[PDB]
Every structure is written in C-alpha cells, then in structure tokens.
Amino acid sequence: DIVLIQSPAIMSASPGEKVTITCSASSSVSYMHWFQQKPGTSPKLWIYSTSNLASGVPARFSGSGSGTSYSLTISRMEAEDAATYYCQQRSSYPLTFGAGTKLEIKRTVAAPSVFIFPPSDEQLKSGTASVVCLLNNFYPREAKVQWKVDNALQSGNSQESVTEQDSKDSTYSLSSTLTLSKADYEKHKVYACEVTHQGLSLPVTKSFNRG
Amino acid sequence: EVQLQQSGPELVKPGASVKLSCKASGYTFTSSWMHWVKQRPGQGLEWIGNIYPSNGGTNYNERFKSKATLTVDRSSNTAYMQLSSLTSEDSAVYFCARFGSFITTILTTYYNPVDYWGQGTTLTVSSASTKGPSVFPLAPSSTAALGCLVKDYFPEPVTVSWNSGALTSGVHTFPAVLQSSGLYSLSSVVTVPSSSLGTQTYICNVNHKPSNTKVDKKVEPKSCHHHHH
Amino acid sequence: LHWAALLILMVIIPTIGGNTLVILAVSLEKKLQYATNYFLMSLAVADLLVGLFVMPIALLTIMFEAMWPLPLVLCPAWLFLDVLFSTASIWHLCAISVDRYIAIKKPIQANQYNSRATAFIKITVVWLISIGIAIPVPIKGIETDVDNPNNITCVLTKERFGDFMLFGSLAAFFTPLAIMIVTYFLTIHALQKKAADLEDNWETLNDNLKVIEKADNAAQVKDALTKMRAAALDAQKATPMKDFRHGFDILVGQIDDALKLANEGKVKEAQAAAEQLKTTRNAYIQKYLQTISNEQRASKVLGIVFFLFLLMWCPFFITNITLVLCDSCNQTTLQMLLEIFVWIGYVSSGVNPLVYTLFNKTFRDAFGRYITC
Ligand SMILES: CN1C[C@H](C(=O)N[C@]2(C)O[C@@]3(O)[C@@H]4CCCN4C(=O)[C@H](Cc4ccccc4)N3C2=O)C=C2c3cccc4[nH]cc(c34)C[C@H]21
C-alpha cells in the first residue's frame, strides 16, 4: 500500500530553535494532510491540503511538500504546540497515516518538589501497604529514585510511573510506589525516599515515622 | 456544536462479537462519509473503512475486511461497527470521524476542511473478569499535595476528577502501571495551598466503566498526636 | 456476467447508426431539405450525441462498479451531457407534437422560404432550454470523499442535487409532458371531426344530387345546387394530396356552370350537367376513402409514438423524484431498479429515429442507398 514514513519518530527542540517534520510517502501523492494529537485528546487536523492551515491554527506553522516527500515547518517554537504529529493520505485508498513524531520541549532545569504519602489505614485492613513518593513539576524527565527503609536500600518493590510532559509548565511528574505487605510493614519503623536530580545540589530525602 | 458521541470502553472475551456505536449531532449526518480509525499506541493509526449514510454503501480496508462490518441507522442517527472473531491483536482505541469532501468541477477541484473526530473507545480482549478499583486516600500531615490511589482494577480505562471537575490546576493523573498480579493501578494528585487545607474540602471521583462501579472519597489530612513528656 | 453488456451494446449501435442515417439523409437528399426536416435532424443530433458520448461511458460504470475510468474532471462533464442531450431530445419531441397539431387544424404559412426561418428559431430555443436546465450540474460539481477517480462513483448525490432533481425534472420532463398530453387529445380531436365534417358534407352533396335528378321547377334545382356549392367547398377545407382538392375545384366549376343554366330558366339543360357531376363524384370516391383510411391510421400511430414516450421516460423521472421525497421508502431498493429505468430512457434515443422515418417512403429508399453506398 501507500505507507507514509515520517522521520524522526521523536525530537526535542528548545524555544526559538526551529523544527521541520518530514513525511515521505511510498508513492507520488496528490496532497498531504497533517494532524496533531495531544495525549488525552483526539487528533485534530492542523493542515488541510499541502500548505493550508486549519481553523484556529497559529500562523507560525508552515507546511510545504512536493510529490513524494512532504514536510511541516514552524516559525517560533513555543510550549503550547508540543504533541505528536501524524500525516495522512487522502489521494487514494486505503487511507494511510504516518507513524508519528513526538515533540519534547527543552526547558531550563527545574528542581522537583518531593512529597511522600503514607498508606491509609483502610488499605492496611486488607493486609497490603503502598507507600507513595511524589515528584512533581521537574525537568528533564530522568530522575533517580531510591527507597531506604531504616537506612537500608530496597529493591524490587518500587514501580515508577512518569506522566506526559505538561502543556503549561512543560514539566514532568514521577510516581514511585513501594508495595509491601502488612506483615512486613509492621516490622520496620521509618520509610524514606531519597531522590537525586541534576537540578539538586544534594539529594533530598523525604521520610516519615510510622504513626 | 458538531459532536460525535461514541460508545464506552468495553472488555470482551476473545472470539466474541463487539458492537461499537457512534452517535452524531450538530449536522444532517448524511452530508459526509463516516470513517473509522483504529489507534494502537506505538504502531500509529490505521484506517478501517468508511460508510455513506444515505445509500448505506460501505468500503473496508484490505486487512479489516473480514473482521469489521460497518452499518448505520438513519432512525437513531448513529454509525455502528461490528468486530467479529475477536483476537488478542484487536485490542486498541477506535475512533469515528468525518472527513472533508473534495468538490470537483470541470474547472478545478476544491476541498473544504470539516474533519471532526469523536471520543475514543478503549477496547480490551481478555478472559479475566473485571475487578472494581480500590480507591485509597493520600493525606498530608506535616503548598501541600493530595491524591487518591486506585488499585486492583483489570480493564485499563478509568477516569478521575476532583470536586466534580471544579479542580483542574495542578492536577496530574499518572498513567497506570501493571502490577505483578496482572491488575492495573494509577494515581492522581493535586497541589493546593496549606491555607485551603482545613477550610476547603477535596474529593476525588473515581469512575470505572466495565466494573460498573463509581466511588467518591474525601481526602482528609492525618492528625498528629502529642507525644508524652 | 459480462454478457449483459452484449445486449446493452446492441442498443448503442442502432442509436449511433439510426441517428447517423437521418443526418446523412437530410444533408445529402435534395428532395428532403424542407423546413420541418431541419428540426427533425436536430432531434437526431441530440439522440446521436447521447448514444455516442453518454451511452458508451455509461456502459463502463456498470462494469467498473464504484470506479470512474476517465479523469475525475470529466465526471461532472459527462453528467452535463446526460441531461443536456436528454432534455433536448425530450423538448424536440415536445416541439414536434405541438407542430403536428397546428399543422393539422391550420396549414397556414406553408411557404418554403418563410417556414424555414421559424424552424431555425424553433431549433435554437430548444437547445437553449435544454442547456439552461442542464447547466447547473457542471457549475457546482459533485462532492467526493476521495481524490483518485479509481475509488469513486460518478453519480449525483441526493443531498447536493436535491432541489435540482426536483426543479430540473419538471422543466425537462413534466413541463413538456404537460404540453404533449393536451396537444395529443386536441390532435385526436382535430381529426375526429374533420373526418366527420367530410362525410356529412359528402352526404349533403348526395341528397342534393338526388333531388335535382327529380325536379319539376327551376327553383328547386338552384336551391339544391347552391347547397352543393357550399357543402362541396367546405369538404375541400376538411382535407390535409392536391388532386382530391382539385376534384372539388373541378366539381365547383361544374356547379357554377349548371347554376348558370338554372337562372336562364333551362331546367332540363341544368340536369344535363347534374348527371356530369355524378360522374365527377364517382372518380373521387376511391380517394375519398383513402383520405379517411389515412385519417384513422394517422390517429393510432400518434397514440403509439406518444405511448412509447410516456412508456420510457416516466419510469425514470417518476422513480427519480420519488427518491428525493420519500424517506420511508427503501433508498437501496429504489436506485437498484433506477439503474434499469436509466437505460429505458436511453433506448428512447434509438426508437425516435425509427418511429419518425420508417413510416415514410422517401426515407427508406434513401437509407438503403447509403447502406448500399
Ligand atoms: C437518463 N439520465 C440519467 C442521469 C442519471 O440519473 N445519472 C446518474 C449518475 O445515475 C443515477 O441514476 C444512479 C443509478 C442508480 C442510482 N442513481 C441515482 O440515484 C442518481 C439519480 C438521483 C440523484 C439524486 C437523487 C435521486 C436520484 N443517478 C445519477 O445521478 C440523469 C438524468 C437527468 C437528471 C435531471 C433532469 C434530466 N432531464 C433529462 C435527463 C435528466 C436524463 C437523465
């Protein structure tokens, strides 16, 4: 069929610096459409026809293309237009889409705000425990988390979960959860969460004493 | 005003039939074709087919030809899609959407953009029965941060809101992580000032469709106790 | 399954051939270049172009379902010619029916030098009416979901051409049809009485020819002979063949001669010419019957050519307008049988050259001459 190959699959660009997404086709196509999908929302078309913008689209976008290879260029990089970009074919059937191109904003390093939540008494009534450590609004994505129970490193019990890049602050968030049994939860006293990040001069630790 | 309301998320055993609906509103329904798109995260978007409401004419993709069957109903003004012989690879998110039409004269061809996509439908295929989510509060003690922990719910799609959608700033609903038990569990948080900690209430509204269970829970701060001297 | 295209193609050949023989007959035969044929030649042009441009391309859509082999730009062009040449064919047939009527009740303006101009402005109005009804299609093209013509069906949608199929079908079919229905019942009536005005006047001509053969005075012979002059001169008016009307001139001339003897008082000399009138009658008795024989015959053929008209275009234009109004009716069951009624409207373009030429001797002698080269 008429597959659409768009490189790169993912790209990161700073504000002001400029981007050019390419969407190359398998055959010679009449026109090319473009879509933007922000995680959590359905895709909305951004450029109908090869070079005409959709309704409500900023003028900084600029699409240009020939027959085989098409492209999508922007004018001024801003945080509001960080998303995945698909291109589709409407010339002939079957309608083919591109794999996608995720855009990551490159923002000044931000320090995470660490929070720790103890397990509710309702969960312990069922025999399980879940200690949560929250890292909110930080950049870049990578952040090293560690669990120290009585100054003893834990391994295998944690499950980190990073969310998508926020559209407003351009910052991520990480959710690390320490799952333990009530049997082993009563055997220890303090539970700590030591996190280190290039946005931190010294690794910060946020702990709590059971009860 | 153009709104395409779609069916809800569903868990269906493999080999059974699925019936997804797509309600239309805001226009005559019969003016444009009704396309269908399947989105499997990581692989991109794939075109299923389209249908024309007036005549009922349907076109399918070469792959989704034997699997999916597209129908419409002018009385109820909805567009259906039946997936038969459900395999494990057919677990994805499905969209219904109208696309613009090219108007072709002897002079030239015009195209008008009327592309409007509808809400997605998360379909999951597995033999395991659904389990309701166990929502647990995440209280502060010592700006503060709140949250709620949804644990042990099998079909993935679940929604969380704070104060019936009144709260939206500083809210981050993390993606679900797959537990060792085979059950998902996500968690959403919200950052609020310490002055609104005792003067205002905060309730998370968990809603899980397949389990057909909805539970709201109030997050209250943990009260400290004066340790004796 | 492709065999049906066999018979469908055996409908295209006569349409091309038949209408091409009419064009070759009027443009090459010096004895056929009179006014009313220049207008019939135009009907063959429309019927030819619809069998040469519309009908062949319409054959591909039946074979290539949901496909359009030609460029997508030519889809609105082919649809423009489907309505154009069809509306022209219908209005030409309508303009013929009305002329067939006026040409009977009043053969006025039968000059060849001045009846050819009216045909030239009669032909141009039909082509301007047919255009005006078929012109909006190419203006507002058809909307399609795809750009490539190999994945589209060239057809007018109910939504984009809703009010056109309604207001366009009336100006093309139901408007000229309304005229063709009344002009029919007024034509069958125009020759119902003229066929009766000939007999009653012909019997008035006998009764007076009976009485003057049995007379005693000179007043009865000139009363009955004057009643003959009027009756004979009115029966001449009730004929459409100048030699039969020439027969009345001869007769009336003999009426005046005998009516001149009656005023001189010579009764038995007037009856000498009255017996000569009885001879003049016996010579045209045969042609009097062939006149009424051709009257009852012309009355029925006008019913067949008219019946075949409503027999072929009604099933389409009725089904067409029904698909625009009725929403309870099964939309797929109508346009399934509408495909059939489209080709019934097409085959009319092939019968028209036949039911308007084969009933004439000079056409047959000329057709076989170019078939023969
Ligand atoms: C013979 N010719 C046929 C031609 C035509 O139907 N061509 C298409 C492409 O073929 C169809 O029949 C197909 C096949 C079955 C389903 N189809 C339809 O539904 C629609 C008609 C329709 C449109 C919208 C709503 C209801 C019906 N078709 C089309 O448009 C149009 C003509 C016409 C239209 C209007 C005035 C006219 N005067 C003379 C004429 C004429 C000559 C006359």
SS in 3 state form for chain B?
CCEEEECCCEEECCCCCEEEEEEEECCCCCCCCEEEEEEECCCEEEEEEEECCCCCCEEECCCCCCCEEEEEECCCCEEEEEECCCCCCCCCEEEEEECCCEEECCCCEEECCCCEECCCEEEEECCCCCCCCEEEECCCCCCEEEEEEEECECCCCEEEEECCCCECCCEEECCCEECCCCCEECEEEEEECCCHHHHCCCEEEEEECCCCEEEEEECCCCCCCCCCC
Tokens representing residue C177 in the block: 């049809």
- Residue B173 pairs in a beta bridge with B188
Which strand ranges, in their side-by-side order, compose the sheet holding B134-137?
B134-137, B144-151, B187-192, B171-173
- Residue A191 pairs in a beta bridge with A149, A208
**Residue A85 to residue A38: CA distance in whole angstroms:** 9
Long-range contacts of A38-45 (CB under 8 A, 24+ apart): A38/A83, A38/A84, A38/A167, A39/A83, A39/A84, A39/A164, A40/A164, A42/B95, A42/B97, A42/B117, A42/B118, A42/B119, A42/B120, A43/A86, A43/B45, A43/B95, A43/B117, A44/B115, A44/B117, A45/B113, A45/B115
R_g over Cα of chain B: 23
**Residue B163 to residue B196: CA distance in whole angstroms:** 14
Do A203 and A196 touch, CB atoms closer than 8 A?
yes
Q: Which residues contact C105 (CB under 8 A, 6 or more apart)?
A: C190
Taking the CA atoms of residue B149, residue B153, residue B155 and residue B160 in that order, the dihedral angle to the nearest 10 degrees is: -30
**Residue B190 to residue B165: CA distance in whole angstroms:** 12
Tokens representing residue B52 in the block: 């024309």
**Residue C21 to residue C44: CA distance in whole angstroms:** 9
Q: Which of A73, A65, A60 is nearest to A24 (CA)?
A: A65
DSSP state of C144: E
**Residue C20 to residue B226: CA distance in whole angstroms:** 113
Question: For residue B29, is it left (φ>0), alpha (ψ between -120 and 50) or beta?
Answer: left
Three-state secondary structure call for residue C205 = helix
Q: Which residues contact C307 (CB under 8 A, 6 or more apart)?
A: none
Residue A140 contacts B, CB cutoff 8 Å: no
Three-state secondary structure call for residue C243 = helix
Q: How far is the CA of C82 from the centre of ligand 1 (A)?
A: 9
Q: Which of C129, C109, C127, C90 is nearest to C36 (CA)?
A: C109
In terms of CA atoms, which chain A residue is nearest residue B49? A94
- Could you check whether C4-160+313-371 and C194-291 share the same CATH topology? no
- Closest-lying ligand 1 atom to the alpha carbon of residue C338: 15
Q: Which residues contact A22 (CB under 8 A, 6 or more apart)?
A: A6, A7, A69, A70, A71
Place of tokens 């047919």: C130
Q: How far is the CA of C304 from the centre of ligand 1 (A)?
A: 26
Cβ–Cβ of C146/A31 closer than 8 Å? no
Do C156 and C143 touch, CB atoms closer than 8 A?
no
Handedness of CA B43, B46, B48, B53 (dihedral sign): positive
Tokens representing residue C99 in the block: 């002329």
Nearest CA to ligand 1 atom 3: C342
**Same domain (yes/no): A70, A142:** no
Which strand ranges, in their side-by-side order, compose the sheet holding B3-6?
B3-6, B18-25, B78-83, B68-73
**Residue A116 to residue C20: CA distance in whole angstroms:** 94
Task: For residue C71, give Cα distances in angstroms to A29, C139, C161.
Answer: 16, 17, 22
Q: Cis bond leading into A94, ω under 30°?
A: yes
Handedness of CA C328, C332, C336, C341 (dihedral sign): positive
Q: Which residues contact C172 (CB under 8 A, 6 or more apart)?
A: C83, C86, C87, C90, C91, C130, C133, C134
Experimental method: X-ray
Regarding the domain delimited by C4-160+313-371, which CATH topology (the fold level of the hierarchy) does it fall under?
Answer: Rhopdopsin 7-helix transmembrane proteins (1.20.1070)
Q: What is C194-291's CATH number? A: 1.20.120.10
Tokens representing residue C322 in the block: 């029904």
Handedness of CA C150, C153, C159, C160 (dihedral sign): positive
Nearest CA to ligand 1 atom 32: C83
- Residue A135 pairs in a beta bridge with A114, A174
Cβ–Cβ of B104/C75 closer than 8 Å? yes
Name the residue among A95, A99, A161 with its Cβ closest to that of B47: A95
Q: Using N-to-C axis directions, what is the helix angle for C242-263 and C218-235, rounded to 10°?
A: 160
Structural class in CATH, domain B128-229: mainly beta
From chain C, the residues in CB contact with B57 under 8 A are 66, 153
Tokens representing residue C121 in the block: 């402005």
Tokens representing residue A53 in the block: 């913008």
In terms of CA atoms, which chain B residue is nearest residue C324? B54
**Residue B111 to residue B107: CA distance in whole angstroms:** 14
Q: Which of C294, C176, C314 is nearest to C241 (CA)?
A: C294
From chain C, the residues in CB contact with B33 under 8 A are 145
**Same domain (yes/no): A156, A65:** no
Name the residue among B44, B113, B151 with its Cβ closest to that of A54: B113
Cβ–Cβ of A136/B151 closer than 8 Å? no
Cβ–Cβ of A97/B45 closer than 8 Å? yes
Residue A91 one-letter amino acid = S
Name residues contacting ligand 1 (CB within 6 A): C 82-83, 86-87, 155-156, 158, 161, 165, 168-169, 172-173, 320, 323-324, 335, 338-339, 342, 345
Q: How far is the CA of C123 from the centre of ligand 1 (A)?
A: 25
**Residue B139 to residue C20: CA distance in whole angstroms:** 94
From chain C residues 116-175, the ones with a CB under 8 A of any chain A CB are 146-148, 150-151
- For residue C346, how far is the Cα from the chain centroid? 18
**Residue A158 to residue A161: CA distance in whole angstroms:** 10
**Residue C89 to residue C349: CA distance in whole angstroms:** 8
Name the residue among B59, B120, B144 with its Cβ closest to that of A93: B59
**Residue B172 to residue B188: CA distance in whole angstroms:** 6
Task: For residue A176, give Cα distances in angstroms to A133, A156, A191, B194, B207.
Answer: 5, 12, 13, 23, 23
Cβ–Cβ of A175/B95 closer than 8 Å? no
Nearest CA to ligand 1 atom 33: C83
Write out the DSSP string of C325-372: H-SSS-HHHHHHHHHHHHHHHHHHHHHHHHHTTTT-HHHHHHHHHHH-
Long-range contacts of A58-61 (CB under 8 A, 24+ apart): none
Residue B104 contacts C, CB cutoff 8 Å: yes
Tokens representing residue C269 in the block: 């000399």
**What's chain B's length in residues?**
229
Do B133 and B161 touch, CB atoms closer than 8 A?
no
DSSP state of C152: -
Tokens representing residue A44 in the block: 């909305």
For chain C, helix, strand, coil in percent to 5 are: 80, 0, 20
Tell me how far apart the 2 most distant CA atoms of chain A are, in Å: 70
Cβ–Cβ of B103/C145 closer than 8 Å? no
Q: Cis bond leading into A8, ω under 30°?
A: yes
- For residue C332, how far is the Cα from the chain centroid? 37
Cβ–Cβ of A91/C150 closer than 8 Å? no
Task: For residue C19, give Cα distances in angstroms to A29, C13, C100, C368.
Answer: 44, 10, 21, 14
Q: How far is the CA of C357 from the centre of ligand 1 (A)?
A: 29
- The three-state (H, E, C) secondary structure of chain A, written as one string: CCCEECCCCEEEECCCCCCEEEEEECCCCCCCEEEEECCCCCCEEEEECCCEECCCCCCCEEEEECCCEEEEEECCCCHHHCCEEEEECCCCCCCEEECCCEEEECCCCECCEEEEECCCHHHHCCCEEEEEEEEEEEECCCCEEEEEECCCECCCCEEEEECCCCCCCCCEEEEEEEEEEHHHHCCCCEEEEEEECCCCCCCEECCEECC
**In chain B, what are the domain boundaries?**
1-127, 128-229
Instruction: Say what the resolution is, in angstroms.
Output: 3.0
Q: Using N-to-C axis directions, what is the helix angle for C267-312 and C75-105, rounded to 10°?
A: 160
**Same domain (yes/no): A42, A91:** yes
> Pairing state of beta strands A128-138 and A144-149?
unpaired
Mutate to test the pocket of ligand 1, among C11, C49, C154, C156 (most ligand atoms within 8 A of CB): C156
Three-state secondary structure call for residue C226 = helix
Q: Which of A103, A164, A179, A112 is nearest to A139 (CA)?
A: A112
> Pairing state of beta strands A144-149 and B144-151?
unpaired
Handedness of CA C220, C226, C230, C236 (dihedral sign): positive
From chain A, the residues in CB contact with B191 under 8 A are 113, 136
Three-state secondary structure call for residue C238 = coil
Three-state secondary structure call for residue C141 = coil
**Residue B222 to residue A166: CA distance in whole angstroms:** 29
- Residue B69 pairs in a beta bridge with B82
Place of tokens 């399947």: B38
From chain A, the residues in CB contact with C150 under 8 A are 92
Q: Cis bond leading into A15, ω under 30°?
A: no
Do C343 and C8 touch, CB atoms closer than 8 A?
yes
Tokens representing residue C170 in the block: 């009336």
Do B116 and B2 touch, CB atoms closer than 8 A?
yes
**Residue C357 to residue A206: CA distance in whole angstroms:** 106
Per residue in B21-40, is it b (16+ CB within 10 Å) or e — as a string?
Answer: bbbbeeeebbebbbbbbbbe
Residue B74 one-letter amino acid = R
Do A102 and A84 touch, CB atoms closer than 8 A?
yes
Of A82, A107, A132, the position where a domain reaches its end is A107
Helices (H) and strands (E) in chain C, counts: 14, 1
Three-state secondary structure call for residue C137 = helix
Backbone angles phi, psi at C214, to 5 degrees: -140, 85
Q: Which residues contact A169 (CB under 8 A, 6 or more apart)?
A: A137
Residue C134 one-letter amino acid = A
Do C89 and C47 touch, CB atoms closer than 8 A?
yes
Q: Which of B129, B130, B42 is nearest to B89 (CA)?
A: B42
Q: Which of C330, C134, C10, A115 is nearest to B74 (CA)?
A: C330
Do C87 and C350 touch, CB atoms closer than 8 A?
no
Do C140 and B107 touch, CB atoms closer than 8 A?
no
Of A107, A126, A160, the position where a domain reaches its end is A107
R_g over Cα of chain A: 23
**In chain C, what are the domain boundaries?**
4-160+313-371, 194-291
Neighbour count for residue C247 (Cβ, 10 Å): 21
Place of tokens 């500083």: B170
Task: For residue A21, give Cα distances in angstroms to A82, A100, C116, C204.
Answer: 13, 10, 71, 103
Do C212 and C220 touch, CB atoms closer than 8 A?
yes
Write out the DSSP string of C2-29: TTHHHHHHHHHHHHHHHHHHHHHHHHH-
CATH of the domain at A56: 2.60.40.10
Give the count of domains, chain A.
2
Name the residue among B30, B50, B106 with its Cβ closest to that of C145: B50
- For residue A79, how far is the Cα from the chain centroid? 13
Task: For residue C38, give Cα distances in angstroms to A30, B200, C115, C132.
Answer: 49, 95, 11, 22
**Same domain (yes/no): A71, A146:** no
**Same domain (yes/no): A72, A165:** no
Which domain does A150 fall in, by range?
108-210
**Residue A61 to residue C338: CA distance in whole angstroms:** 49
The shortest C-alpha distance from C143 to chain A (Å) reads 14
> Pairing state of beta strands A61-65 and A69-74?
antiparallel
- For residue A83, how far is the Cα from the chain centroid? 9
Name the residue among B33, B54, B106 with its Cβ closest to that of C145: B33
Q: Which residues contact A154 (CB under 8 A, 6 or more apart)?
A: A147, A148, A178
**Residue C342 to residue C61: CA distance in whole angstroms:** 13
Residues after which chain A is broken (C–N above 2.5 A) are none
Name the residue among B33, B54, B109 with its Cβ closest to that of C158: B54
Residue B45 contacts C, CB cutoff 8 Å: no
From chain C residues 168-207, the ones with a CB under 8 A of any chain A CB are none
From chain C, the residues in CB contact with A2 under 8 A are none
Do B54 and B110 touch, CB atoms closer than 8 A?
no
Of A56, A81, A107, the position where a domain reaches its end is A107
**Residue A153 to residue C337: CA distance in whole angstroms:** 80
Task: For residue A152, give Cα distances in angstroms to A149, A193, B210.
Answer: 5, 11, 41
